[PDB]
C-alpha cells in the first residue's frame, strides 16, 4: 500500500531594493560638506553604482524565478479534473486580489534619506504567473515547458507520473478513488498546517527582519558623535571656529562614510546569498514543476510525482507531491529460476515466493503474476548462478498449439 503526502519547502527569491541619498545621508544643507566631500575622490559613486547593480540583480532574480513561460494559460471552466479537488490551489475570481486560499493565508500570516524602491513585478502579476504555471502543469502535462502545450487528461498524466518512477500505470486505474481521496485529504491537511504551526515561515520573516534591522541600524548610527565635538551639523559648524571645525567635520564624515561602507558591504553579501537561493529556486521551478525529476530528495522526501508553486511575499513556496510506500511484507526471493538446465532472469522485477509457489512482481508494488517466458529472458545454463532454485515456468500457448 502507498501513501501520498504533500510537503512544504519555502525559498526566498528577492528582498526589497534599496537606494541611498549619499551626500544627503553624509551631511545635508552645508557648503562645507560639499567642498570637503567632493575632494574625497569617488567614495560615493562606487556605492551608488554597487547598490543600483544590486537592485538590477534583484529584478533579474524576480524575472528568472517566475517568468519561465511566455504564455498566460487560462484554466478550463470545468472544475472536475478526475476527482481531484483543485480548489485550494487553482485561484478563484471571487477574491479581489485573484489569489488562491493558500497564497492568501501565506500573505496574511507573513507580517533620513534612505529610500526603498518598489519592485517591477507587483504581487498581482506574480499571482498571474503562478496561475498560468498551474494551468500549464494541470491541463497540459509536462509537455509545455518544451515546445507548445498539448492537451492531456489528468488521470492519464498521473499514470504517466507513476510510470516515471518504475511502477506500471495499471495500479492507478484500480485505485483512482483512493488516490483522489488521499490527495484531497493531504491538501486539506497542509492547508490547515500552514496556519496551525507558527514557526513554518522562518526564511521570509528572517530576510525581511534582517533588511529592516540593517536599515534601522544605519539611522541609529546617524546620531553618534564618532569622537568629534558633537553630532549636529548646525552645532558643529556654528559654535566652533573653522580651523578646528574643518578637522572635526572631517572626522565625523569619515566615520559616517565608514558606517555607510559597512552597510553596503553587508547588503552585497546578503544579496549574493539571496542570488544563490534564487538560482536554487529557479532550478527547482524548472525541474520539480516543469516535468518530473527522478533524483531522490531534491523534489520532496520520497519518489517525486509533481509539484505546485504558490506566490509568496518576497519569495516562493512549493507544494510537492510525494509517493511514500508503506505496509511492508516479508518474502523469500531468489536471483534466478532453474528450468530444463537453463536459467531464467526477471525482465522488470524480482522473483518472489511467499510459500511453496513463485511469482514475478514489479519492484515497488505487490502484483503476483504467473512466471511466463514473457516475463523472463534466458541466459547461459544452470550451474553458475549462486542461490538458484528449481521451479517450472509456464509456457505461453500451451493449450493452443494442440487444440
Amino acid at each position: 500500500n502507498f501513501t501520498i503526502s504533500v510537503t512544504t519547502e519555502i525559498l526566498p527569491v528577492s528582498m526589497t531594493k534599496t537606494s541611498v541619498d549619499c551626500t544627503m545621508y553624509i551631511c545635508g544643507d552645508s557648503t562645507e560638506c560639499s567642498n570637503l566631500l567632493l575632494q574625497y575622490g569617488s567614495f560615493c559613486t562606487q556605492l551608488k553604482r554597487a547598490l543600483t547593480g544590486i537592485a538590477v540583480e534583484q529584478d533579474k532574480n524576480t524575472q528568472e524565478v517566475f517568468a519561465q513561460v511566455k504564455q498566460i494559460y487560462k484554466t478550463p471552466p470545468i472544475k472536475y479534473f478526475g476527482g481531484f479537488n483543485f480548489s485550494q490551489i487553482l485561484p478563484d475570481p471571487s477574491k479581489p486580489s485573484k489569489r488562491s486560499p493558500i497564497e492568501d493565508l501565506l500573505f496574511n500570516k507573513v507580517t533620513n534619506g534612505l529610500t526603498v524602491l518598489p519592485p517591477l513585478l507587483t504581487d498581482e502579476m506574480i499571482a498571474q504567473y503562478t496561475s498560468a504555471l498551474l494551468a500549464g502543469t494541470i491541463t497540459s502535462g509536462w509537455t509545455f515547458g518544451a515546445g507548445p502545450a498539448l492537451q492531456i487528461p489528468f488521470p492519464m498524466q498521473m499514470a504517466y507520473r507513476f510510470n516515471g518512477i518504475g511502477v506500471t500505470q495499471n495500479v492507478l486505474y484500480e485505485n483512482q478513488k483512493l488516490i483522489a481521496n488521499q490527495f484531497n485529504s493531504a491538501i486539506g491537511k497542509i492547508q490547515d498546517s500552514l496556519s496551525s504551526t507558527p514557526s513554518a515561515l522562518g526564511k521570509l520573516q528572517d530576510v525581511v527582519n534582517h533588511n529592516a534591522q540593517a536599515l534601522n541600524t544605519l539611522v541609529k548610527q546617524l546620531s553618534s558623535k564618532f569622537g568629534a565635538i558633537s553630532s549636529v551639523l548646525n552645532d558643529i559648524l556654528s559654535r566652533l571656529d573653522p580651523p578646528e571645525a574643518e578637522v572635526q567635520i572631517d572626522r565625523l564624515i569619515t566615520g559616517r562614510l565608514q558606517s555607510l561602507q559597512t552597510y553596503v558591504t553587508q547588503q552585497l553579501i546578503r544579496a549574493a546569498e539571496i542570488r544563490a537561493s534564487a538560482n536554487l529556486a529557479a532550478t527547482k521551478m524548472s525541474e520539480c514543476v516543469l516535468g518530473q525529476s527522478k533524483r531522490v530528495d531534491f523534489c520532496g522526501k520520497g519518489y517525486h510525482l509533481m509539484s505546485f508553486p504558490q506566490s509568496a511575499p518576497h519569495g516562493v513556496v512549493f507544494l510537492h507531491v510525494t509517493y511514500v510506500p508503506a505496509q511492508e511484507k516479508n518474502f523469500t526471493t531468489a536471483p534466478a529460476i532453474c528450468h530444463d538446465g537453463k536459467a531464467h532472469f526477471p525482465r522488470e522485477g524480482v522473483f518472489v515466493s511467499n510459500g511453496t509457489h513463485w511469482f514475478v512482481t514489479q519492484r515497488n508494488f505487490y502484483e503476483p503474476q504467473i512466471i511466463t517466458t514473457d516475463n523472463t529472458f534466458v541466459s547461459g545454463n544452470c550451474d553458475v548462478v549462486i542461490g538458484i532454485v528449481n521451479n517450472t515456468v509456464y509456457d505461453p500457448l500451451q493449450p493452443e498449439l494442440d487444440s
Binding site: 513561460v69 504564455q71 498566460i72 517591477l120 498571474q128
Partner: protein, 68 residues
C-alpha cells in the same frame, strides 16, 4: 516616490512621471520602471506590462494531442 502636487504628467505607483503620456493599451516591456509600468518609444508612452498572449488551451476527459 514623490507625489507631485507641488513640483503631460501621469502619476504612477512609483512617484511622478513627467513627459510620458499614459496609454490604456498594453505592450511588451522594454524599459522597466516599477509597479508594473514600462515605457518605450513607439513620442514616449508608458503602458501597463503585457505578460504575453492569452493562449488558452481546451480540456476534456478523453482528448489528447500528439505531435507529428
Amino acid at each position: 516616490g514623490v507625489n507631485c502636487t507641488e513640483v503631460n504628467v501621469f502619476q504612477t505607483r512609483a512617484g511622478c512621471l513627467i513627459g510620458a503620456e499614459y496609454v490604456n493599451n498594453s505592450y511588451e516591456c522594454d524599459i522597466p520602471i516599477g509597479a508594473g509600468i514600462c515605457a518605450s518609444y513607439q513620442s514616449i508612452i508608458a503602458y501597463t506590462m503585457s505578460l504575453g498572449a492569452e493562449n488558452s488551451v481546451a480540456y476534456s476527459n478523453n482528448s489528447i494531442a500528439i505531435p507529428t
